[PDB]
Design an enzyme around this catalytic site. Structure first.
Site, PDB file in Angstrom:
ATOM      1  CB  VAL A  58      -7.359  -9.892  -2.626  1.00  0.00           C
ATOM      2  N   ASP A  59      -4.576  -8.665  -1.556  1.00  0.00           N
ATOM      3  CA  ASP A  59      -3.684  -7.578  -1.156  1.00  0.00           C
ATOM      4  C   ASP A  59      -2.296  -7.657  -1.801  1.00  0.00           C
ATOM      5  CB  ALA A  60      -0.137 -10.463  -2.856  1.00  0.00           C
TER       6      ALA A  60
END
Lengths: 75, 52, 211, 69, 75, 75, 75, 75, 75, 75, 75, 75, 75
Positions: A58-60
């Protein structure tokens, strides 16, 4: 001037709005981890690694947005 | 209602209420109470008589 | 001031109609078809009372009933076909009697109960609780204004609604659209008036509970 | 830790009784313990020793066969 | 002038809209912590650290947005 | 003129849109507090402090947005 | 002219979009109050004050947005 | 001309987008009322007044947006 | 020309985006009605009137947006 | 100049906003994986491959957005 | 030219963004119909008419948006 | 120049924002597949084909958005 | 030139953003179908036709958006 102005506007656009998706998505995952462990405490070492994998994926998506932002600011 | 017509309109409301209370509430409240006292009365009589 | 003075005349006429109709039909008949409805009004008004109940029960009870009655006056303009300078600033006038009366009302509970003998003390450990004066002060001002803002906002929203539905209906050469709008808008209106009595009851049950 | 009104019972045999103000026990579907003030509810729990603090700080792990408590 | 105007518009864009994602995401996590602890009170010391980790990861996405905002305002 | 116009537009952008995230997020938390206490009333003094912590962290994300707004209006 | 036009556009932007967050958030809280009281009616006097606190905190985020709107319109 | 054009654009912006928040929020509340009454029918006279209070508070946020819209159109 | 162009852009903005809130909100309510009646069929005549009230209140928020749209197009 | 300025603005628009959908969607999936495994631990090797498939399909939608962004920046 | 350009931009704005609300809302309702019938199959002829009513009311909000779009394109 | 600039801005707009809907929607479906299989493992071969159908229908909506994006970039 | 530029920008706006609503809505429905069939497998032939009806009604809202997009591009 016009190209430089466009870079600074574009940097603001790509940086902020897309990063909202992980701000929400990282939280969705940790809420699932907390609720899953509260319902079944013995499953903690099984699902904690899943939460880390999932948070990083998700953070990517924002890190992609941030990358375009930094390219516009500094490239 | 550029000036003062709104004033007249509103006063008609306030006085309207006062007239209701003085007159209607005497006519209205009392006139309406008859069914309350009545149904209430016939029922009450029924209950007491049956019980005793 | 036809478009103006004529308007205040109009709303005044409606309110009078309320006043007299009250005592007049009240002495009679009602009767029964009439009596039973009066039961809906008064008794439902009593259930509504509990909740605020005793404080304004004569004062607010008489008032809310009169508010349905007087409120129907707008339905009359909607009912007309179903051109102005009665009902524009007659509607502004009703918004003024109602909203103005609401600002008046905060005070009327204020003196009527403390409430206002205590409302000067509204700051209180509450302004100390909550130690900042900006919170308590902005809150209370937002309350006094807010009561007027809400009640007046409803009133003007209603009057405006009347004006608009009127516009849509009247301008168009095709009748059918005007009819469907006006019927739907009519259900809308009735709901709006009852909602008004409810709103009075909401401000009032507030008053009983308020502080 | 004894609660107010508590008992472990079967018609056949009441396992325990009296108050227990703390009870460690594993609900069938979730974590279980006892502590006052929670709301009324019903559950069943898998078998196992249930370590419960009871009156005068008595506490013991009570083997469950599991069942509806 | 045009470049300076673009900086101030870009700062507003990147600062506000992206930070909504953690405003929501930090709250999602604390709601999961509260609901998990209400359902199973004994799991409090296990899931409280998870909530802190998760809140900080969600808060980092806006701090990225805020960073771009401050670069546009002051860099 | 153009720089001043850009400040006022930027102030509107950063102030309003980002603050929606806590308007939602503060509410999400209080809904979790209310639902958790309704399900288990004895857990009230444990989760009320969690709700306050969590509300303040969610409210800090808009206060960042508001800060940028005020900088644009008055700095 | 350009500065005045920017004020009116900025007022529209900051007023409307951010206030959506409490329109949703005030409702989220009242839905939690209604569902919590329906599930457990005896908890009504405990959670009603929580709902009021929470509604006011959510409503403060738009009031910030509205404040910036009014500054742009009238300050 | 530019100021008048800005008024009409600003009126559209502040009127429509913010009012979405109550369109959703009024519905969230009525869904909670319907679900709460379906689960526990005896709680109807207790929670119906809560639904009305809550709907009016959610509806006030758009009425703020609409107010700014009307100011821009007619003030 | 500029004022007329601004009217047509403003009409599009206020008409479409705000009306999304009831498109969602009317549906949220009917989903609650369907789920409540499926869970407890005897509560149908009690909650159907609630659904109608609630749908009309949600639909009024877009009708406000549509009203501003029509004013911009035709007033 | 105008074409180059349009490229940089377009790159910001397409990169950031669309990528929010997977930031959320990747998280939705991992939350389902964590909750499903917490409820039924024996189903872990069956649903983990489903989570990977699903995460990659959700991540492909932003990678499309990122692709258009990079075309605008460098093509 | 400027008025015609404004019509085509306004048509795009009002047509697409508002219609998202029913795209979601029609689906929310059918999901409630499917879940309600799966939980209680005997309630199918009672709730199917509710689903149709509700879908049509949600679909009317976009049809309003589409109406403004067509007015801008062809009126 | 102006037409070319409009193409590149339009390509960014249509590519990124609409594709968020499937990024979310593909994930919603896989979360339902994972939760359904976790609750009832024997239903896996029945619902897996449903998940594929549903993912492809959700993915077609962005592919429409991407199609318009590519037309604007290359047609 | 200005009218042609407005067509291409308008096509991007109406095509992408509105189509997000079905990308989400088609997925919401299939998630309900999967969850309903997992909970009650015997109800599959009853609810599958409902899912198809519902998916097509949700997909029609974007097809409206796409229609306006194509009119702007080619009409």
């Amino acid at each position: 001037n016009l190209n430089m102005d466009l870079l600074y506007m574009a940097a603001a656009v790509m940086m902020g709005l897309a990063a909202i998706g992980a701000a929400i998505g990282i939280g969705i995952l940790g809420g699932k981890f907390l609720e899953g462990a509260a319902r079944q405490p013995d499953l903690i070492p099984l699902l904690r690694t899943q939460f880390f994998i999932v948070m990083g994926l998700v953070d990517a998506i924002p890190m992609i947005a941030v990358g375009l932002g930094l390219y516009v600011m500094f490239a | 209602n550029l000036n003062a017509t709104i004033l007249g309109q509103a006063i008609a409301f306030v006085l309207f209420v006062l007239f209701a209370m003085k007159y209607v509430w005497p006519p209205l409240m009392a006139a309406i109470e008859k069914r309350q006292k009545e149904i209430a009365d016939g029922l009450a009589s029924a209950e007491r008589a049956h019980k005793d | 001031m036809f478009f103006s003075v004529v308007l205040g005349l109009l709303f005044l006429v409606l309110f009078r109609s309320v006043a007299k109709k009250a005592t007049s039909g009240v002495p009679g008949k009602f009767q029964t078809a009439i009596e039973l409805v009066i039961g809906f009004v008064n008794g439902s008004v009593k259930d509504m009372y509990h909740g605020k109940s005793k404080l304004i029960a004569p004062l607010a009870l008489t008032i809310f009933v009169w508010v349905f009655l007087m409120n129907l006056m707008d339905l009359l303009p909607i009912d007309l076909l179903p051109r102005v300078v009665p009902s524009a600033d007659v509607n502004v006038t009703l918004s003024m009697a109602l909203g103005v009366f609401i600002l008046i009302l905060f005070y009327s509970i204020k003196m009527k109960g403390i409430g206002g003998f205590t409302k000067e003390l509204t700051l209180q450990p509450f302004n100390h609780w909550a130690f900042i004066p900006v919170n308590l002060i902005l809150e209370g001002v937002s309350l006094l204004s807010k009561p007027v803002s809400l009640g007046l906002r409803l009133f003007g929203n209603m009057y405006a609604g009347e004006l608009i539905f009127i516009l849509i209906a009247g301008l168009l050469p095709w009748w059918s659209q005007w009819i469907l709008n006006v019927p739907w808008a009519i259900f809308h209106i009735l709901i709006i008036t009852l909602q008004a009595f409810i709103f009075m009851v909401l401000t009032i049950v507030y008053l009983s509970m308020a502080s | 830790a004894m609660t107010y009104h508590l008992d472990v019972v079967s018609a056949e045999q009441q396992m325990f009784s009296g108050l227990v103000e703390k009870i460690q026990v594993t609900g069938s579907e979730g974590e279980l313990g006892i502590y006052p003030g929670h709301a009324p509810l019903l559950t069943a729990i898998k078998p196992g020793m249930i370590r419960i603090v009871k009156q005068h700080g008595h506490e013991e792990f009570i083997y469950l066969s599991g069942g509806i408590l």
